[PDB]
Amino acid sequence: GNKVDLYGKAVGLHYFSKGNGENSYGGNGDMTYARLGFKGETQINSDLTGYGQWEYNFQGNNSEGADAQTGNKTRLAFAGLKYADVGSFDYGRNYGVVYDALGYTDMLPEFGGDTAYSDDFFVGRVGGVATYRNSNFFGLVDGLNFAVQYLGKNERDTARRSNGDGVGGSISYEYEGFGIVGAYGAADRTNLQEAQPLGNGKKAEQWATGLKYDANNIYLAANYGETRNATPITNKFTNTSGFANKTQDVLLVAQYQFDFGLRPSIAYTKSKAKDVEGIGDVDLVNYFEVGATYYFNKNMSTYVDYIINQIDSDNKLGVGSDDTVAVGIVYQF
Amino acid sequence: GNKVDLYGKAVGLHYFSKGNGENSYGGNGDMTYARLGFKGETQINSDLTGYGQWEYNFQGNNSEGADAQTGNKTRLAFAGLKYADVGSFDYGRNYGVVYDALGYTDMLPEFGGDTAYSDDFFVGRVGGVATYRNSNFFGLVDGLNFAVQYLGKNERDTARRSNGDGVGGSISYEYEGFGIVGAYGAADRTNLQEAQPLGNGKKAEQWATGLKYDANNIYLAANYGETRNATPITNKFTNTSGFANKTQDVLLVAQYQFDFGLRPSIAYTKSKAKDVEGIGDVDLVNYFEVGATYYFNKNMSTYVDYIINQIDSDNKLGVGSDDTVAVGIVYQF
Amino acid sequence: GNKVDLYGKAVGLHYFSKGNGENSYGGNGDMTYARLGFKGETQINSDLTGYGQWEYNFQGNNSEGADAQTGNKTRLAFAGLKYADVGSFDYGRNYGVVYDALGYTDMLPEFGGDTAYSDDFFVGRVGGVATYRNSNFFGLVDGLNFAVQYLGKNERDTARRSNGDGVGGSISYEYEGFGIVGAYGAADRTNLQEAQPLGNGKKAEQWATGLKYDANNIYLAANYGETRNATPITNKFTNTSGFANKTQDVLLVAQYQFDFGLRPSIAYTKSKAKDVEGIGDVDLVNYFEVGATYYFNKNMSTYVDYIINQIDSDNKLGVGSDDTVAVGIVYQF
Ligand SMILES: CC1(C)S[C@@H]2[C@H](NC(=O)[C@H](C(=O)O)c3ccccc3)[C@@H](O)N2[C@H]1C(=O)O
Ligand SMILES: CC1(C)S[C@@H]2[C@H](NC(=O)[C@H](C(=O)O)c3ccccc3)[C@@H](O)N2[C@H]1C(=O)O
Ligand SMILES: CC1(C)S[C@@H]2[C@H](NC(=O)[C@H](C(=O)O)c3ccccc3)[C@@H](O)N2[C@H]1C(=O)O
Hints:
about 325 residues; mainly beta; 16-stranded antiparallel barrel; two-stranded antiparallel sheet; globular; membrane protein/antibiotic
C-alpha cells in the first residue's frame, strides 16, 4: 500500500518592466521555469503512515551554455512519519514554521509572499529542520492545530544563506471559513552574519499572525509580523549588505473564485525596516496589486499580475520603484 | 482527461578520433549522456487543448567531483494552447522557427544538423519565444501549414548566447511524401554581440529552405540556407570570436529503412562563411557522412556514425580536419 | 513489452560530531539528499533483452542561492544488451568491476564501503566503462559468474578524477549462502596524476577478494584488497595531494535481520597506506561500527550509524580522529 505521485509543471512566463528593468519590482524579460517533484506516502499499519517529498526548480530562461545552471535548486527534500492521533514528524529541507502564518497571503498569481524569504530562518524554505505537527489537538479539539520545529545551524559560505540553531512554533484555529494563526521563532546568528556592516545582534527573531476567511468562493486574508535581525537587505549604493535590525510587515489580500474559472486578486503589501545602520527608517516593499488567474481546468491555467510599485525613487537603499507586469501560461500535472 | 508521458533515454556513447582529438570533427572519448522530460496535454473542451513540455540533458561523462555539472541544461520548457481550427500558441524555451526548415536534414544517427546552433536566434533551441502555428490553413487546405514566432531580447553574459528582439516565420506544403518548406527570421543584435572583433552589423538574419521525400521507407532531403551576422564563429589562432558576416549552407541526406531494423545513412554537409574580418572566405563545416542505426524495437537501438572530414589542415580558422566515428547504444522509453 | 520503473528516495539525514566537525570521520550537520532514477528493460525477442539505467543525486542540504549545485551529480548512466546464455554487455557510467568484490561489505546503514571511491579506476562508479558479464558460465555451471570490463581514458581537469586506459575483471562462486569473489584491474595513470607530489608510477592497480555468508537472516562478509598508485590521498598539513603508493585494506561486517524489521550491524574497517613520500606508513581509515536500521516496510525505514574512530590524533596525514553518529529517515519508491 504505497501511493507515489510524480508531479510537475511548465511555466511560460514573461515580465514587463519599463526598459531596464533593474530599477523595477520584478525585473524585465523571459522568466520561464519548470518544476518537478515527487510526493509519496506509505500505509505502514492502520495508525502509522510514512511519507516523503522532493521538489526541484529548473529555470527555463538560461542558455544551454555557461549560465545553464543559474536559479536551479532543490526546493523541498524531506521524509517523516505520521502517527494516528499523536502527530507528524519530518526532517530535511522544508517550510519554516512561521510560513504557517505567511502562507495566508502567499496566494498571488505571480508575486506576493514578499516576506517569506528562502533560507531565512523560519519564514521560507530552509535546510535542516525537524518539524513536529499536530492536528485537532491529538484528535480532541477540531480546528485546533499546532506545530514546533527545530532548526540546526547552517554555516554556509554567505551571511545571507546562513543561520545558527533556533526553535520556532506555530498555533492556529479554524472554525467554518475563518482561520486564525500565530507563529514565532528565534535562532542564533552566525559570526559571519554578525560581521556584516548591516544588522547588529546575536539572536534573530520573526513572528507573524494571520487572519483569514476562506469559503463561499471568497478569499480574504491579512498577515502582520515583525522581525529583528532576520530580514536580508542590500544597499544598492555602497554594495553593502546584511540584515535589517527590525522590520514591520503587513500584507493583505482579497480574491474571488468564479465557477467559470476566473479568479481576480487584489492585494496590498508593505514592509518597512527600522534602525538600518547609516539610514534609520526605509521601506523595502510597498505596493498594491491587481491581477487574475484564469483556470481552464486542474491542468491548465493562465494569468496576469500587475504590481503598482509605491516605493519612491529616492529610497535610501535603492529598492526599485517601477511597476512590473507578469504574464504566464501553465501546464501542470 | 489529462495525458502526461514521462519520457527519457540513456545513451552509451563513444567518439573515436585520431589521438587528440582536438583537431577533429567530433572530439575523442566518452560522450555518454541521458535525457529526461515530460510532455503533457489536457482536453479542456472538444475544441481546446492545453499542453506543456520539459526536457533536460544530463551528461553522463563528467566525474562526481567539481566538473559534475558540465553540459547539463534544460532543452525545452514551454506551455501553450491549441484551438480547434485556429491554431496553436506557446511560450518558453523552444525550437526556433527556421529549424522548421533545418529539421529536414537533422536526421543523422549521431552528428549532422550542424547549422541548427543552440541559442542562435532562429535556428535551434532558444529561450523566450512566443510561437504561433497553423495546420492545413485553418482546416481549409490539407498539407499547407505555417507559423510565426516572436523572439524576445536575451541580454546574457556572453555574445555567443545573446539576441535582441526579432520576428521569424515559416511556411510549408506536403503532398503524398514530398515536403517543401521555407523559413526566415531576423532580429536585433545586442551591443555585446557587436563589440566582438568578428561580425559587424545591427540585424542578424537567417533563412533556409528544405526539400524532401519521405514515404515507402525512403528519406531524401536537402536544405539550403544563408545567414548574415548570425552564425557563431571562433578563430582558434588568436582566441577571437563572434559572428560570421555571411555564411551559405547546404546539407543533403539520404537514408533507407529496412523492415528488419537497419537504417543506413549517407549525408553531405558544407557551410562556408564570407567576409570574415581578417580572412575573407573560410569553410566551417565540410564533410561526407556514412553510418547506420539498427533498431531492435521502439525502445532499443544501436548505431555508428562516420564523418569524413573534408576541412583542410590549413583552414584559416582552425576548424578541425580529422575524421570522427561515434558508436552508441540507446535505451529510451 | 517494455518495463520502466521510475524510482527514488528522500533522505532526512543528520551527522553528529563533536563540535567542528572538521577533525571527525563523517563531518557534522545537515546531510539530507534525494535520489532519482530510471531503470528500464525491453524484451526484444525470447533470447535478447535491452536495458538502460540513469540515477541522479540531489543534495538537500544546500541553500537556494549560490551553493545550490554542490554535491549534485549523475551516479549511473548506461545501456546495454543481454543475450540468452551468452551474457550482458553495457557501456556508460557504471560500477567498476572490483566493486563486484567491495560490494560484499558495502552494506552499512550509512557509512562503510570506504575503499569504493568514485572516479577511482575500478573500485567505484566511474565514467566510460564497457562491461561484459556472464552468469552461471554460459548456463553451464550454476553459481559461477564472471565479468570483464574495459575502461577508457578520462583526461579530466583534476588528478583525483582522472584515469588512463585500463582492463579489469572479476570471478565469483555461490553455493547455498556462501559467496566467494575475486577482482583485479589495472590501468595507465595520466601525466597529471603522475605530476602530483604524492604517488609515483605509471600503472595503477587494485584488487580485492571477498568472502560471505548470506542466508537464514544472517549477513557475514569480509573483504581484503590492495592497491598500488590508485587510492587518492590528501595531506591536511601542506595541502598536498595525489595517490597512495600502496594501501592494504580490510573490511568486515556482521548483521542480522529480524523479521519484525530491525537489522543491527557491526562492522570493522582499516585501510593503511604504505611508502607515502615524506611519511612512510600512515593509516587512512580505522574504525569499528555499530548501528541499526529499522525497516517499517519496503518504502520506509529509519536508522542510526555510529563510527568509533580509531585513527589517532597525531596521524601524519591529518585524517580525522573523532567519532561520528548519523541519524536518517528514508522514504523510497
Ligand atoms: C499539491 C502539490 C502537488 S503542489 C503543492 C506544493 N508545490 C507547489 O506549489 C509547486 C510550485 O510551487 O511550483 C508545484 C509544482 C508543480 C505542480 C504544482 C505545484 C507542494 O508543497 N504541494 C504538493 C502537495 O503537497 O500535495
Ligand atoms: C516523441 C518525443 C517523446 S521525443 C521528441 C523530441 N525529443 C527528443 O528527440 C529527445 C532527444 O533529443 O534526446 C528524446 C529524449 C528521450 C527519448 C526520446 C527522445 C521531443 O521534442 N519529442 C517528443 C514529442 O514531442 O513527442
Ligand atoms: C533496486 C534499485 C531500484 S535500487 C539499487 C541501486 N540504487 C540505489 O541503491 C540508490 C541509492 O544508492 O540511493 C537508490 C535510490 C532510490 C531508491 C533506492 C535505491 C541501483 O543500482 N539498484 C536498483 C536496481 O538495480 O534495481
